[model samples]
Target: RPWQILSQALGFPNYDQELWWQNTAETLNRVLEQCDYSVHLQYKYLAFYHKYILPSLGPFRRPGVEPEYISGLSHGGHPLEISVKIDKSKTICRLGLQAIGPLAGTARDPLNSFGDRELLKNLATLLPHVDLRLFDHFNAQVGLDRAQCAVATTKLIKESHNIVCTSLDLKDGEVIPKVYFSTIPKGLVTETPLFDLTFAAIEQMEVYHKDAPLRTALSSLKDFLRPRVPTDASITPPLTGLIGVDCIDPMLSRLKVYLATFRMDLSLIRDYWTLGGLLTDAGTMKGLEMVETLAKTLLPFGINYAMKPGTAELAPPQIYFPLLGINDGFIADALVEFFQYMGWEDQANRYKDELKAKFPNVDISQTKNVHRWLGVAYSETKGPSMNIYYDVVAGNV
Candidate 1:
């Protein structure tokens, strides 16, 4: 029944009839319940598992693999991240999978592994106009061989950490796939070289201009965060940042950088905001106020900036809030209020109505825990949009 609701809400065609996916969904539902994941959030991740992950497994789908193996739920980190983009015209939803393990056995180079390469090829097929060579070019420029290996090693050797993620962003019916690579700043010695490599890769890709506001913002944020890196390795250092490149028109592709504010105080965040010139316009300032309010109320994570190399001005940054220590109803209420704050009352009501319609039997007010993250990006033209990130169980071998 829960699977049916999820499938219907996500507009999946006859997913309930598919024995393999249906059984997987049922198992995931049981796991979600056991893990105390809220019904509302469960719907989102379950739908994503059924819609995207299950089909993508291709030749590697094992018959009785535990969900947590492929999904990374046992590690207490979110595997699936969802974003709800709201604008004047319509609302769109995007899905991202992070820390995706090597489901088809471990390869020295994870991205070039058979399954991952196939995944990229499948994603490329969705974007017909984009040049396939761009994938090779991006890999070479970003040093995918090394970066992915690093990510895999970090996860294997470290505390099941994630330094890379892949996202499927659908805009106006076109599916755009994006890869994000991250690095944590432990100290200047370790941080500087990684930053230099990333910067050089960006330059090689020609994704951003040397003089662009984005470049300055990234450099400034990095400099500001450098001294803040904690001396104690025992204390988990907040993820310093990530850089994202999408599979789209090469000319239109922009590098999106996310800088985390988890370690900084509000004053410091405000200072960085000012120093980085993130307050580009009145809308961004208003967005900052929203960020401050959310920071005070919830756990503030970071901010994301998307920029084109040729652009002179920085695009509005998206503020991130991790949905921890809260229930689904609280998150739902907060999002509804946020939508109303942005003067998108219709979208707010739509969100409420969707929840009510999909989970007609369950009371969302009950406090059930689920790992999720919320983000809001402000735009002068498009108004405000929201991003939601969470964990899901795909499958294991």
Candidate 2:
């Protein structure tokens, strides 16, 4: 079926040419463009990608890129890699191409080959420089009042009960929605390090896809609901897409809140133990009985917490790198590998094996099945939603 989706978009599976339409030309696209719904969702994924995922992955891949990517088995190549796949319509879509450019690791489209160091270094610097939270506002490009950003972050934090741990806000003394790699401490082990980063990687990937460089280019764009749509759909245009951002057109914009509370439980392998400390091995650290009891009690927070969630195991903050807005691939890998050896690998693998045995029916490929998003609307304007979408990956978290 994976190949089916690809073929369908490329026309091999009957990609429809009629599906191609101009940006903002149709009344529907115009309505979508007014709030610029799709543009802002791109920003949320961008920040998360640059933070947690890229650190682990070797580099960013651009359009023409081959299947090469950061792998547990191998770790070296272009600092960044992006995949370009065929889309549902044979003709490519470029309307959103420019908006998502900064995320690119290369000036020209990426290929199956590794990325250029010059481009990778540029991206490594530029990503952290931008304030993604600003994009939460329908028209973030308008301007940012640093003071109001703080006000909004404060308001959101007071209402958030799910953010288990975090660092000082990247900008303006504000806080973030979840414990991001750039924001959180390392002592706290969370479920699925490799898995989590991979998911984050997949999120941006769905947005910017390319087929061979000169072949075609397309960006994933999504929109839902509006006063003009079918009568059954409702009057308000809902925020629809991966990560579910851009819901602000009808509501006040603020940092995304409790967005991480809904992640899946992969404790059988590993999880954020205590506050920010690594669980080392949560599911069986206390034996199968403790794991069973913990799993049941934590279910209220969802399966994600069932792996393990609480402030009980919190440890002093540890920084593998301790720097935000900066990236040194070699050093980053050293730190990551170092942590893995300091019982991180044991804890991760222990839980992983337990989960596998406990759920014997799950295929090796199905080790991961969690989806992350930005936020749902405040007025409950829309059903549960996310502005970003990630692919399924291995590991936990």
Candidate 3:
């Protein structure tokens, strides 16, 4: 149902590509281009990986031997590591502004347009709980009184994220939190055309207002600026984009737990191209069989909605190389040394610097270990005992 709207936005007719899906392999090849990925733009994948990609790996084993990867529940089990460093060169970042974390194993929702007020209320509650205050921030968005403001409030109330309105529809004086409170300390003010600025609180509000950090930080910044203004209440929330950075420590922490549970040697798996894909049939089948089961179950979720499970096997090695290789192949990225530190068998420093460069500035030196959001691979014909895994058992026709 939701896919229809997404399809139309991409210039597809009536927003459904399932109709002409007979050309399965042809369609898949065009989709997984690393060239297609970049910040703020995912070409808007419709949760396809969850829907079609992950579940397609099945039937590579002698049935009943594979693990069923339940979606959305098994994740977020470990902590990630984050180290914010000032980018000296600045030119290294693709945006040329020296940004933080964007590791390959994990993905982030940089922006979500369909958020709602209940979403805000929930976020307020969830922030402190999400990965040890990873979501906590000193932010307060204020806006001016206007018709659009009223309309936007209604949308937030109706539970729409008001994302479009936050940027395009809100009034001019929208002050984002700390900025709004800036005016109370200073006597300066007045004008409107809707310019956004981050304003922090100038004094401690524990005696009167809440949000301790805002009060503390602004109180500090306000004194530095003097009579100019420490806070401001505006006509709209700041139009400035919000960055959702994934701190390395907490992220890597989670990866550590993941490695312990799987007992996987990340380096060996990653460098499997160099490992020669092993030579044992049972060992190889052990991996591919799981890939098939994952694919079989996930297809109904709307991933790669254009084709049936197992139909898009070689999507894009760069993206699928890690996953596709599991059935009958191995990856070059899963280095053996990455996990040594997780178990303390080796220090996280040995080869971490080399690996960290892949995701510049978001320190991986303290990695102490590594984890991979590895993918699965399976089809009806590619691996050992593939047929039994996917066979739909039934009696008499």
Candidate 4:
């Protein structure tokens, strides 16, 4: 059902060389307006509780996969991310800006420094333009009176509108938690209508909040700026793998976990591609066959929804494919490394061969370290700032 709106939004009854999103500009705008406030907005990132956490819960149809309270789930559980830019100059949307998040490890606003300044009273003007009722649920969380909630709302709106740069690294200790901002030319602020400014303001709210660094892993941005997943893998429920059924459960689960863990080494895969470091063996064929099957299961689904539109002809597509390479060199490289670690170099080569076949369009021989440039690819391709993009996309579907 999450795919229903996003698919409809993506479905245009016309012919155009451009992507669906670019073609139906006004319609898309309306869709976003009616949607939920973005936690990670490219100004207006949106999502449903179901689609965001569905991947981590395992197959949707299976019993016990979904729980009653999913709204507070973390990124790995939800993975919604988006970035909104006003006139392409200021990045206003970001992680943790939305009102979502449970109390334990919830993120703080980066604009906490600017709280004392007269920065947010201007929001008094902006507030009338926004849906004040949307904050009702959030206001209750503040445990305040109606008159005072406006102050809190103004503050929250300020927190939402504030934007900061986000950077993530595999090396956790190397990164620092900090942000920089100088009052932007308020001239543009006036030129931009309140609707546009309000949207940008909300987008700004979603970024790495003040205490975000302490909450998320790797000292990165998307860490706690989003929601919290079920902590303690020990208490984490065990998922039963789907079998004897024609479904994407296993491959999808693997891909989701591979992405969720953030342990897959893209650079290591690149090294194996350029300078040879594999050894072949009997079990190699089995490993190669398995990964190829996963690739076949994965591709043709068209996983990169943020670049264009996210919905498909039927349900929402595999939202993780774009980041993990959709069973391309990235997936192959990961499997190859695993095989090599298990002392099966030949399987790695055979697996690479299958990867070539699966995505002939990709030149594995090109020798580009695709992993290191993920952020570059993300920015270049205009991927969603959070998994919530899919929910926004899917709701439109």
Q: How high is each candidate's TM-score?
A: 0.69, 0.20, 0.20, 0.19
* lDDT of candidate 4 over 236-330, digit per residue (tens): 11110000110112111111111122222333222211112232333333333333333343211112111011211111112222332332355
Models, CA RMSD each: 7.6, 22.5, 23.9, 21.7
Best-to-worst order by lDDT is 1, 4, 2, 3
TM-score preference between candidates 3 and 4, better one: 3
Question: How much lDDT does candidate 3 score?
Answer: 0.22
lDDT of 2 by residue, 179-259 (tens): 211111110122223223222332333122222221111110101112212223111121111121211111222221111
Best by TM-score: 1
Candidate 3 residue runs with Cα over 4 Å from true position: 1-118, 121-141, 144-216, 226-397
Worst 10 residues of 1 by lDDT: 69-78
Give Cα distance to truth, residue 95, candidate 2, Å.
20
Candidates' C-alpha lDDT: 0.53, 0.23, 0.22, 0.25
Q: So what's the TM-score on candidate 2?
A: 0.20
Better of 1 and 2 by TM-score: 1
261: Cα error in model 4, Å: 15
Error of 2 at 59 (Å): 9.4
For model 3, residues 1-397, the per-residue Cα lDDT tens digits are 2334434444322211232121121122122222233322223233331232112221111234332211111112111111111111110101000111122011221111112222233323533422312112212222222343334434332222112111010011111110001111111122321122332211211211434433443333223223322233332321211212121122221100000011123343322211223223554445433433333332001010001111211110111211211221111123223223123233223223433333332333232122222333222244211111000010000
Q: 1-397, model 1: which lDDT tens digit per residue? A: 6777765666544432354454345545554443345676567556656655655433222354333323332223324444455566665556665434345224443332334335667656645854444445545554334445545554443323334456776444356677766543212223344444555666665434434655665565556445554333322444335677676676666667666555667776565555455455677787668767666655447766676655555555666666666676777787777767667787677665654433344555663434356676666776655665543222110
Worst 10 residues of 4 by lDDT: 239-248
